[PDB]
Structure 1
């Protein structure tokens, strides 16, 4: 099928709340090799965010039950967490490898580079949420490095209020808080991203202001939550 048909299919699936369909469309659009338009890019992101999101959320629930059941009830919770975990790693590995094979090497401008480098940061972070063993330190460093290169590219080439730069600070700050356990570096990173944007609320445009202000709100709420 042709890219534009697949896109319209993805939008039907989205409207129907059938995100696995949605991801399968956008995955196959990506596999055609062409650079993604940015409506398309957003579609890929939404599909995959909702598909891992359901697992992340089941994983968390079954994880809590597993650790709060000291019998053979624990054996059953463990096996179910693991089965959930392995679906979740399959979802991240899929996005991760779409990002290595198509999306990052095709990115022509800073904006897209930051977008995908961020996504690569995120999907590594979802894998880190869930990793045990020697696995962990590698996954984490992957995530950190993807964020870091994205961060550097946005401080040099995007405005302080660009939604995609703001979003990257928000998620990079979350990585520092949640994964690395460095609340102090997470706060400083979020606080500067909020302050630099709030001093240029001029300069937002019509296509971006709802997103940029909503992210600024979350930077602040996180700030509030982490200073408690």
Structure 2
């Protein structure tokens, strides 16, 4: 279909909770090579998050049950792995290279972080983790630089990078310092929040806080 049509179909897929369709549409818009709009970036991300999410949740179930169980877990793991490699390849070939605006660079580097992190969950492992850490750290640097503590993308990033430290690097204290600094800095500057971003920024500040409560209790 055409870009506009694909975007429109991704939105309908989204409403119909047909995330594999949604992702196919957004992968197609991404493959034409024009830079993604903010709306298109969010559609891409929501689609793949749900597509990969189904597989992570299934994998968790079956890995926890686990030879039949192992083969199934292996099966779910390969789909999971292909979806991440898909996203990582789009990011490497189109999105990161073509970003240019800092918000998008942060967004896509955060996403590379995430998808290597999902690969790390089922993982070769040391390189995946390093790839994850590398992406998040560069996203995190640009975000501190170009971004202000209440920006939802920066808060989002702190949130997942804190999870990465906690879950993948098995470092609760770094996860907590990251979350707490992120939260503290945002709440110190709430007057910097726009009408557009306040609900997203406060929801994400609460997620940081819920995490910190769990990790320090």
Partners of 1:64 and 1:105 in 2: CA distance: 38
Which one of 112, 116, 139 corresponds to residue 104 of structure 2?
112
Which one of 94, 97, 115 corresponds to residue 102 of structure 1?
94
Normalising by structure 2, we get a TM-score of 0.98
Cα deviation per residue 1:91-125 (whole Å; 9 max; x = unaligned)?
Answer: 00000000000000010111000000000000000
Partners of 1:112 and 1:18 in 2: CA distance: 26
Partners of 1:224 and 1:160 in 2: CA distance: 20
Aligned to 2:133: 144
Rg larger for: 1
Q: Secondary structure at the match of 1:34?
A: coil
C-alpha displacement at 1:2, in angstroms? 1.3
C-alpha displacement at 1:57, in angstroms? 0.0
Normalising by structure 1, we get a TM-score of 0.94
Aligned to 1:91: 83
Provide the alpha-carbon RMSD of the alignment.
Answer: 0.9
Q: In structure 1, list runs of 5 or more residues that go unmatched.
A: 68-75
Q: Secondary structure at the match of 2:191?
A: coil
C-alpha displacement at 1:37, in angstroms? 0.4
Partners of 1:7 and 1:206 in 2: CA distance: 25
Cα deviation per residue 1:55-101 (whole Å; 9 max; x = unaligned)?
Answer: 0000000011109xxxxxxxx00000000000000000000000000
Aligned to 2:147: 158
> Where has structure 1 moved over 2 Å in runs of 4 or more?
none
Partners of 1:26 and 1:40 in 2: CA distance: 7
Q: In structure 2, list runs of 5 or more residues that go unmatched.
A: none
Cα deviation per residue 1:109-165 (whole Å; 9 max; x = unaligned)?
Answer: 1100000000000000000000xxxx1000000000000000000111111000000
C-alpha displacement at 1:10, in angstroms? 0.5
Q: Secondary structure at the match of 1:129?
A: helix
